[PDB]
Design a protein around this ligand. Sequence first.
Ligand SMILES: *[C@@H]1O[C@H](CO)[C@@H](O)[C@H](O)[C@H]1NC(C)=O
Ligand SMILES: *[C@@H]1O[C@H](CO)[C@@H](O)[C@H](O)[C@H]1NC(C)=O
Ligand SMILES: *[C@@H]1O[C@H](CO)[C@@H](O)[C@H](O)[C@H]1NC(C)=O
Ligand SMILES: *[C@@H]1O[C@H](CO)[C@@H](O)[C@H](O)[C@H]1NC(C)=O
Ligand SMILES: *[C@@H]1O[C@H](CO)[C@@H](O)[C@H](O)[C@H]1NC(C)=O
Ligand SMILES: *[C@@H]1O[C@H](CO)[C@@H](O)[C@H](O)[C@H]1NC(C)=O
Ligand SMILES: *[C@@H]1O[C@H](CO)[C@@H](O)[C@H](O)[C@H]1NC(C)=O
Ligand SMILES: *[C@@H]1O[C@H](CO)[C@@H](O)[C@H](O)[C@H]1NC(C)=O
Ligand SMILES: *[C@@H]1O[C@H](CO)[C@@H](O)[C@H](O)[C@H]1NC(C)=O
Ligand SMILES: *[C@@H]1O[C@H](CO)[C@@H](O)[C@H](O)[C@H]1NC(C)=O
Ligand SMILES: *[C@@H]1O[C@H](CO)[C@@H](O)[C@H](O)[C@H]1NC(C)=O
Ligand SMILES: *[C@@H]1O[C@H](CO)[C@@H](O)[C@H](O)[C@H]1NC(C)=O
Lengths: 268, 268, 268, 268, 268, 268
Amino acid sequence: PTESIVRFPNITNLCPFGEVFNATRFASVYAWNRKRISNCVADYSVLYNSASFSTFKCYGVSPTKLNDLCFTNVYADSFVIRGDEVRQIAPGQTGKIADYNYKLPDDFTGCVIAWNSNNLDSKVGGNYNYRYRLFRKSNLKPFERDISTEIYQAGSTPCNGVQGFNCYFPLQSYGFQPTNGVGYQPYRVVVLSFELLHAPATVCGPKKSTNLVKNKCVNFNFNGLTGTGVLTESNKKFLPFQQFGRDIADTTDAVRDPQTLEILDITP
Amino acid sequence: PTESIVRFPNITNLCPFGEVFNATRFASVYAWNRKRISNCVADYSVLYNSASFSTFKCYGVSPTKLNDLCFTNVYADSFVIRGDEVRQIAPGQTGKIADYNYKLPDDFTGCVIAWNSNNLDSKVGGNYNYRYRLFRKSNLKPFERDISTEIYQAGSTPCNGVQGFNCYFPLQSYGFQPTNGVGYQPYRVVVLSFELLHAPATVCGPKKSTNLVKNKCVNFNFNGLTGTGVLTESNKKFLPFQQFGRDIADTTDAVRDPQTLEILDITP
Amino acid sequence: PTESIVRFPNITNLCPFGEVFNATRFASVYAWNRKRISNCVADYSVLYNSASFSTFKCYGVSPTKLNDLCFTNVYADSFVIRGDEVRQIAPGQTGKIADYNYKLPDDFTGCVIAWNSNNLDSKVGGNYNYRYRLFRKSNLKPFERDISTEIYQAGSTPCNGVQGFNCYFPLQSYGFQPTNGVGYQPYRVVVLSFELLHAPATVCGPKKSTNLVKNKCVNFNFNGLTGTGVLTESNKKFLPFQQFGRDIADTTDAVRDPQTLEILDITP
Amino acid sequence: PTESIVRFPNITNLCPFGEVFNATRFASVYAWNRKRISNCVADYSVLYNSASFSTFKCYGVSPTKLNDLCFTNVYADSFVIRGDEVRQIAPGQTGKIADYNYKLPDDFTGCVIAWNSNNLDSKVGGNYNYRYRLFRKSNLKPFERDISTEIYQAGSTPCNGVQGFNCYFPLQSYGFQPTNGVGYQPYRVVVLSFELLHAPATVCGPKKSTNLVKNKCVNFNFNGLTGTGVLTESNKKFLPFQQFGRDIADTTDAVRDPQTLEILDITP
Amino acid sequence: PTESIVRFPNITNLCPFGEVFNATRFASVYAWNRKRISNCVADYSVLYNSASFSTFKCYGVSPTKLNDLCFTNVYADSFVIRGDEVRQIAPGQTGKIADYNYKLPDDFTGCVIAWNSNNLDSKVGGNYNYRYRLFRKSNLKPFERDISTEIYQAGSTPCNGVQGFNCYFPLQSYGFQPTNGVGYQPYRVVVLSFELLHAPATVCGPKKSTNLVKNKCVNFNFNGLTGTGVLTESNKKFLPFQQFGRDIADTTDAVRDPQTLEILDITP
Amino acid sequence: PTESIVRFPNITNLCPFGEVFNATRFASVYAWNRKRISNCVADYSVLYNSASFSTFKCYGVSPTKLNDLCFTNVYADSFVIRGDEVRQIAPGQTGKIADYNYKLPDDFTGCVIAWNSNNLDSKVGGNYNYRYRLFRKSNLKPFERDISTEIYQAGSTPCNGVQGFNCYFPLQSYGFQPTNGVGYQPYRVVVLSFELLHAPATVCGPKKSTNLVKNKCVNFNFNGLTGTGVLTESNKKFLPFQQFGRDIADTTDAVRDPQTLEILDITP
Ligand SMILES: *[C@@H]1O[C@H](CO)[C@@H](O)[C@H](O)[C@H]1NC(C)=O
Ligand SMILES: *[C@@H]1O[C@H](CO)[C@@H](O)[C@H](O)[C@H]1NC(C)=O
Ligand SMILES: *[C@@H]1O[C@H](CO)[C@@H](O)[C@H](O)[C@H]1NC(C)=O
Ligand SMILES: *[C@@H]1O[C@H](CO)[C@@H](O)[C@H](O)[C@H]1NC(C)=O
Ligand SMILES: *[C@@H]1O[C@H](CO)[C@@H](O)[C@H](O)[C@H]1NC(C)=O
Ligand SMILES: *[C@@H]1O[C@H](CO)[C@@H](O)[C@H](O)[C@H]1NC(C)=O
Ligand SMILES: *[C@@H]1O[C@H](CO)[C@@H](O)[C@H](O)[C@H]1NC(C)=O
Ligand SMILES: *[C@@H]1O[C@H](CO)[C@@H](O)[C@H](O)[C@H]1NC(C)=O
Ligand SMILES: *[C@@H]1O[C@H](CO)[C@@H](O)[C@H](O)[C@H]1NC(C)=O
Ligand SMILES: *[C@@H]1O[C@H](CO)[C@@H](O)[C@H](O)[C@H]1NC(C)=O
Ligand SMILES: *[C@@H]1O[C@H](CO)[C@@H](O)[C@H](O)[C@H]1NC(C)=O
Ligand SMILES: *[C@@H]1O[C@H](CO)[C@@H](O)[C@H](O)[C@H]1NC(C)=O
């Protein structure tokens, strides 16, 4: 391996992590706000190295390596919970938030970023505008959003839309005050989930593309696909929707150049 | 009485509470900051209607009735403590902040205003820029300020100005973190002391001044002096430092108007 | 005083304290249940000797001297509150229950009897059927019950009968669990308020009457009217509503006998 | 498998769990009560649906599947402890109850049911009738009790069974009050121990016995012996104690019918 | 008033406060040790200037003035209690220590000293050598001890000297741990009660006497009896047991010398 | 296996564990004290018998088997830390002590022995003599000691050798009170480190040295070399640095007798 060749798509616009994180008002956890992120350079070490997030805990990927990876789509799910419920944003965990408000799948790949928000989300006398769903008949499916407001029937009597004995509203207020304990303290949570599935990659890190060298042994990083081999011209006519190539041994022997749209044969 | 005549003097500028309360940085408790406020208009109801002040304790005045009474001079004292010693900013209270950092007289008149500033004065990894005087050979007198950094000799041996065995540095750091408990979270405290000595009033509130009505039994408030009488015209010989006259009964019977310099005979 | 004479009306049915204290379901604190107790004999010893009432606090009446006094009418107010809200059931106290749910007068005469009911009012998973009023525009008057359920306008926008941002339901659930700490455990509260008017006393204790002794110096207890003097047969005519004979000097001169209906002058 | 066939013995007398769980007074933890349950149909639904059991921790068996299985002998160990020491009733923990009062084996197959009993085991002024062994020479063996009252020597002095300096009574009282916290509140604990040997099962659930359908491929459940097969009429001569039968390869190939005492060959 | 003439008796030996306050082992609170301090000089400002004592509350006298007074006798009561029970050592208090172990009179002239002894009295594995009386039929008279060990019958059944159901041992061990809470460390309490009989005082403070100067208007401190006057030779002879000479105004004008034992007359 | 043989070298002197564990004053954790224990007999059972130690965590070796083995060298480390920071003395653990003060290797062979020291290290007025490094530019490598007192720079502003804004002293005083909780409580930690590497072993347990039995099948522990075989004479030419031989199968077949320096042959 004489050289190393990194080829990423030629994109420059930064996708708004600022509008996800530095928003004035977030949403409640029963109505958590999901933003689609695609076609951007994403500097994850801006979020990592900044001393502002108490929890930057990442599942299925390393937080330091996120600049050196490319994902097809990023989902940013922002909401506000209490501190003791910050642990509940994890696969294979139980609680009110995990069962009824926000559920993470067991194959989750992404990061959970939680930081304290006392000055923004508390008020003397109580901040009651952040509600969590307390009552539901069944647990939530992963990434299912439930915003329905129907009176929960906890007994045998029908409720008919009126709260009362054994008939409760499903949404319950946090009631934040700045004098509250650190467990009952407002924490803003943003969950980044990365689609690593077979698709064209849109969100890529700030790594700079190098020029293409052929007919030599080079390490290569084509759109997040890492390998070592000899890149040459290929007579393989790719159909325009195809990015990779593959053989009977299930090995990537052909890739499409992200920039020049050139099909390169990877001879090992 | 028929109507009330409130006479406040011709003052146009506002009292500078803005850099007292909304400053970017506050000083520490050992170097507690003091601002002298005089000769302006102060609207205390803005501070009273705030939804962020957790503690608004007052002494010698009512927390409702502070705006209508108007004062000689306002001493605004600003410092950052943590939440446990907010009770130590009370008169007669004993503690490390009370004995060694900031001591209030037992006859203190004014209001203590404190609010949590965890999003401002705490950083992830620790904020150590706010210090308190842990050691002093004598307890502080009321309202004295000690910023000396001399090494507190706690043993018999002279160690000559270095930290070591029983040779402690007098200041120590709070060490604020955003994940700390509410006792160990930063609280910005602004003591607002007011003196009520025999002097003409310099700070008075946003209450409007009404026109004079003479020769009729009216309730009057002549710039802090409230009475009932038939405010007739005068022929008195008031020297220009004489705010209000007296008599053999030691009762107020002649007041010179603050807005026109006209002496008025009070007759009940 | 040679002898002691006690005359109480010949009433024999017990007061229904068993219906008050041993009811299966107590109402919520916002809808506290008042029962009027009159025309019976009240045995307060069964309340006092039994050891389950953790809080037994009487105001204006000595708690061990409940039996000898006679009362006109008794009001028993029953409800369920959490453990830290028990101290607010007292004259002159403040809190959410005192302001918005149940306010005692500052001149309150009677007892507060609170006992733990964790077995009867908590189920595993949460008992959400006990609600307290959390939002009100103004504090309650003494002995005033508010069961209104209109949406509380916290902000400047009209609520229009729907819960949402800055519009809250005034009632909030306790959510009792048996694993919750004693601050957050159910306590059943019965407040006995005795009124002592100029009306004839109907609620009298279990003290038994003696025979009347006339023309001799005795110490008498005439239906709660204690005193000492020579009871003599009188020619005074009382009208049927009149029960005793206060003179021009406002001292009791004659008493109507509560059993035989006899007019009895008191000499000293 | 066309259908499911379940054959259980026709025992209809219900197992005495009412005497275990609803006894008027339990025993102290040093003298914990053990009851032998056998030869009855057991209903575990009344334990699971009940909303008073705060702890239902089952080791080795699924708590929902207690109703499904059959056992031979059930050991019910009932006692009263305090809340913080409920966590000591589990296989493999330490503490005063685990070491000196009640030890659970590491191979424990059974459930632990703990519920709060503040209404029944606490008295205002203290309930000191519940004792625990505080001092012992060596830690207890599993399922061993020590009701001995011998004065524990904690020094080097033979003090002849008299309490005093370094000679302590082995048993110490709890002293339960309703105002005490949940760490120091009474919890009644019933430990159910199921033993499953190579023995005929006497403790089973209320699952109904269906009619005998032979010569068809059925799922079958013969007295807890689950499987799938084509049950036919046999010619094997089982001895009366011999319940099922095994082939050369130690697989169940014949069973006796629990109801009609008939030998049925299980061919697959 | 030129110069004071302090005359205190020529007492040679210091009071044994060191043996009381510095003893190795203190007695338990049910069997507290009382020591009679008399015929000596006692420095009380040594105790105050030492900062080891957490509590120094003195009732009926000020702690700083104690070196200036001659008391007739001193009683030193030393015991070990819990921290939360330290407040029970006060005149007019309720609790287990006040009712059953150590009762202070309401007319108390003395000082209460309490210092933490987690270092010397606590021990890992438990120090159960300190016991307190938990059960008694009646409350204690002031300065009364109970060393009885009879079984407290709390039911109808007799006990026959055997512990069991409703029969409890009167004394319960404390169980001191070094890992206990702030209310549960051992505290050693010395109660110094100053007997002030109208007698020759024998416990005097450390004040250097001044030789007698007569026939001039001087201050004097004769045996703690402060006064101002002219001291003259006395014509009358007082009885050998009687020192104070009272007048019609109940003021001493004829005092015996506490060094040369001769009568002196005080005149204005 | 007829006769067990234990051959240890003839080492007479006892190890100085008294001067390490029972030292009067320990060093602080930034300047932790390392003592080299070699060429003595060590009794670790008497370390294990004491119940004063609240943590006796041994990593890689079991505490019961400590007397069995032999070591070449022992590293006895000693320091004082608070109770919450005891857990950071562990392999593969993070914290202030682990990063900045004392780091164990990830594969550590030895025992962490920590006991509470409230009685020895606390004093009234606070013991601030114990300091810990709170600020460092880089994390400590394992078994590396840093005693630098250079002022740590946090901001871009140079410190210039004085304490100030964003320039802190790297060492912080603990502040131990006798009234502190168990979290801030002084704990004395000794970390014994053992090397299991093959060398002439100098420190061994108190096991008795048996005689030499030859030409009989015996168990043997030759300086901690456990095995079973028929120990016969050898003609192998062991050099002085060669202590135990090995065969072509890499098994121990010839061991030098530690007492005699005589070469013996293991034969199974
Ligand atoms: C949010 O704003 C702050 C400004 O104080 C900035 O430092 C931070 O980087 C911003 N975060 C994002 C994600 O843009
Ligand atoms: C950018 O990429 C596109 C294809 O995605 C390609 O057609 C174009 O030539 C590239 N431009 C440059 C300057 O590399
Ligand atoms: C403004 O102030 C001056 C002096 O303070 C006073 O004489 C004058 O009357 C005031 N102006 C008005 C319009 O009253
Ligand atoms: C500080 O700034 C906020 C920003 O809205 C303002 O509402 C508040 O009144 C300011 N405080 C003072 C004392 O002016
Ligand atoms: C409630 O019922 C119990 C039954 O055990 C009884 O002891 C108690 O006296 C009753 N309460 C009243 C107020 O009578
Ligand atoms: C009972 O009281 C009534 C009046 O309330 C009276 O008429 C009647 O005589 C009394 N009974 C007796 C036996 O005195
Ligand atoms: C105990 O009694 C209650 C009374 O309703 C009943 O619901 C419960 O099922 C009983 N417990 C058992 C184990 O049968
Ligand atoms: C019930 O079972 C027994 C054996 O357990 C059997 O002898 C008896 O016949 C059965 N009864 C019926 C009605 O089948
Ligand atoms: C000391 O006191 C005695 C009486 O107790 C007295 O007789 C004697 O004179 C005194 N000593 C002096 C030096 O005055
Ligand atoms: C107890 O001993 C210490 C040790 O020197 C001493 O400082 C203290 O003064 C003594 N206390 C008394 C009352 O003598
Ligand atoms: C420390 O001294 C005590 C004194 O009794 C002794 O028991 C203990 O064994 C000593 N510690 C060690 C580690 O030997
Ligand atoms: C002790 O061991 C040495 C070798 O380590 C040996 O030379 C010496 O003779 C031995 N002494 C005794 C008394 O066994």
